[PDB]
Amino acid sequence: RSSLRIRLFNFSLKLLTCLLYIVRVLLDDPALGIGCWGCPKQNYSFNDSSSEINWAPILWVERKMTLWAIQVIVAIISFLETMLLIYLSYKGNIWEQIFRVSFVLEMINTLPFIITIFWPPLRNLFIPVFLNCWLAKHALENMINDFHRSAMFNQVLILFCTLLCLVFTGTCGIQHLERAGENLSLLTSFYFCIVTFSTVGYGDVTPKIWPSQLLVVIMICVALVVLPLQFEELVYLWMERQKQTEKHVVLCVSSLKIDLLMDFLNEFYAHPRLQDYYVVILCPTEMDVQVRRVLQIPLWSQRVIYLQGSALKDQDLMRAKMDNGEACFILSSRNEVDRTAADHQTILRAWAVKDFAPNCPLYVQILKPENKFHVKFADHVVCEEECKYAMLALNCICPATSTLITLLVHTSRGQEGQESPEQWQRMYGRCSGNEVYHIRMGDSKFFREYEGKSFTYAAFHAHKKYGVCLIGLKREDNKSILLNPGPRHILAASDTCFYINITKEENSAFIFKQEEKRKIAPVLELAVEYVKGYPPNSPYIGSSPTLCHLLPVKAPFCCLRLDKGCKHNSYEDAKAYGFKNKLIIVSAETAGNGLYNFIVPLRAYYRSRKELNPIVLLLDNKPDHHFLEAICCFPMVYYMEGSVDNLDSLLQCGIIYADNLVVVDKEAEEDYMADAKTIVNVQTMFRLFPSLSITTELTHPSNMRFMQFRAKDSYSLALSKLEKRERENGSNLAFMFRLPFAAGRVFSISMLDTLLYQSFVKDYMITITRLLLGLDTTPGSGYLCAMKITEGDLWIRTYGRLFQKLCSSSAEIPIGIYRTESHVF
Amino acid sequence: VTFSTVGYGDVTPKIWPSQLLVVIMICVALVVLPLQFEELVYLWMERQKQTEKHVVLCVSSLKIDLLMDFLNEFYAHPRLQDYYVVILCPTEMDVQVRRVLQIPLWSQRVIYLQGSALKDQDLMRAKMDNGEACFILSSRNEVDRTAADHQTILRAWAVKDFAPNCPLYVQILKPENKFHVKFADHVVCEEECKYAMLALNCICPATSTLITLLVHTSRGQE
Ligand SMILES: [K+]
Ligand SMILES: [K+]
Ligand SMILES: [K+]
Ligand SMILES: [K+]
Ligand SMILES: [K+]
Ligand code: NA
Ligand SMILES: [Zn+2]
Fold first, then answer.
1. Nearest by Cα to A501 from A450, A432, A548, A562
2. Of A63, A300, A565, A795, which is most buried by a Cβ count within 10 Å?
3. What is the 3-state secondary structure (H, E, C) of A593-605?
4. From edge to edge, which strands make up the β-sheet containing A693-698?
5. Given an 8 Å threshold on Cβ–Cβ distance, is A711 in contact with B157?
6. A267 alpha carbon – ligand 2 mean position (Å)
């Protein structure tokens, strides 16, 4: 880097000799006397009447003995180093050096100092050393090419430099050229030129001689031809440019849309702890127009950073400060028609981030279960197909389970519908503020008093006292969370207790102070027939093995088809079968590992064998033999070719005597229109079979209002006003009061996104959800069930007394109630 | 007169600290004002990308033919001259449509809003709760008419959900989808009328011509 040192020293000397020229003119007083270095110095005066101008003041300037030598030495070093570079670098051309305009200014401002050595009398001769500052500007430009010390900042700094040189040349030129007439000082000429460049033109000080007038004219032309070139360069940098704090998180997506961004921002910033965080979005695609408008909002302008780049490029991960991020959220693209390709992209992105920043927690959203074991290294992984079908299957067992999970994984204060005149809306919006929290039991004011007591005793009494629902615990010895360990489990101070409550125990410091404001058998302190086995052919790695009701012998693939008759049976539709129970018809496009996660919860060993519901898969495409091999061991699981829009196929399914119809059918530029085909197709069957229970999954929660649409219905139309009011108050649960959602008829997969975002603050949330869905089976962990409250159980007047009876007899823990009212339409 | 660069000179700083103040402050002016100018330029460029009794026109893609047929028929009545038309169309404004909107007969009457009926925010910008009528028109150029009919069914549902007391005027392509928008005040099925007129032309010649002239507002001056 010695070359840059040479130019830096060359730049330093250029500004030094210009400043030394300023020192000269500051100590040069013409009124004392001006001459040719010695004898005959002549005093002079300016006559405005006489047009002739004496050139002796302009030609000759009095130069100190120390001053002339030190500038000559500086000029000699100036001349030596510039020729040192010229001879050092030819680069294939000996000519053209003088035509480029830096040599002519160099030599004309330097070699006069060399020739002044020969003759004493002309040592006091004027040489325009102020023009040398232009070369110093040039010497700065070549420095910018190598070292920064911010891409356009250099041009702006250069623009200021050429402005300074224009001003500097003006002051020295005017002060010296008017030293013959009106004898302007430097300070006055400096103010003279500043008001000239800004075109003010005051006129109080003006050039009174023809040379000075000409200098202003030629200089005004120079300014008007050199400044626009700098302006155009700044314009070029600006147009090409148009195309923070600590504790940030990176959000890696393939395409970012307004729905995904708002879902993340609402959930991420719903916590007070994560308010000092800013979000970096690494998305290869250009920013969406709707996304741009939201980012211009000044709540999100300082918080959300959008970077156009790829996680597979380490340069883009450096711009995102991935090595410093608190967390990484890799989210799959669901709009992509090829989900295997999308899953491959997120696997690579997870691998790319892990390779770049190993000590960065990964939060990966995986589409297909077969690709889940490639990102198993990630701290938190959510498989959409596993949870979607497990929730859809549980809705067939426990109604509105998806609605129950949706509200729990959503961060809310339970303030929705608190002004509503309807009692059910107030209690529904209040109970929706429940969440799942964890606390060390010894540190827990809710459960510390139950030391040495059974889990069910603590769960009941904490609910009876504070209204908290102890659902599970995690022992300090193991890492496994158990839902409802049972009455045999004995509580300890090291256990981490998982409870459902409106507010965190620490955040409930008011009720404990409010507690201080006040200041059935009892639960005990101390406690063809089917085989039962595991499905043989697991379809994918990571499939949690659940003990299920299994056929004694594998069913041949011909017997799994409800359409065609075979050797074993001539039945051609569900009527010829004559099932004892009501059918579950699943209208899916393709049969994969997701549909496997639908059949497993319905065939589990704890599910009643007499209440087993036949499962009819209404597939658009013929299932491959691997899926049939995975489901050939399950009793009363059949498939057929058809769709929800074909009424012939649905009547062939047994829709007449089907208790549930699950529509998972998959089909646009306008985002909300993706569900148009599914919504209308489901609506047609809502009108053909009004009593049928149809469960649907929609891409957008905003479309949940269209599931069972009664246009001539004031009540459902009034719910729009309530939903808009909740949306006015900034509630993230605004779709909540729509009737199809509240009854469990619809859920969106976008809630799974909120579950992943919650895991950044609740590392147990994913495990709890899968434990409820049965997606992961830990020995000694409970399962979600439902019981019907019939008229023989109405002597149990309240929900608390039911909690007592369950905890005293069967040790079951009620999560909540699915309530039904008469709402004639 | 200093900031405007007029510089009259009748009053001027006669002392050096006053002269220096003018110098530094002129430099301050030339370095602080452009920063405000670039922010205005930044706001202006992104910005580039009324009365009572209006009607909203909800389409998927608006072309010059569809717009002029509406404008000619809507404004052929003297009662509907104080009305202005709001077009809610997700697609960007057509080049041919833009030129006609520049015509100052239609500049004050026709507003084009880029948005969806399925977003309530776009229905608030259209003042849907105050509109006199809503016209949901199917896209006939679309190769998939079932999908287009599904889009208009959702748009009718979205407008009915947002503004129940707003008369809907829905244009339906396929007869099988007509009973989903039966709640609308006025529904036209194109396939029903097209084939009924084509069949009547085989019975009564030029029945379609007879219907065409009747449903067109004209003074009989042709
Ligand atoms: K002027
Ligand atoms: K909640
Ligand atoms: K809460
Ligand atoms: K299907
Ligand atoms: K007519
Ligand atoms: Na069969
Ligand atoms: Zn068979």
1. A432
2. A63
3. HHHHHHHHHHCEC
4. A637-641, A615-619, A583-588, A658-663, A693-698, A746-748
5. yes
6. 11
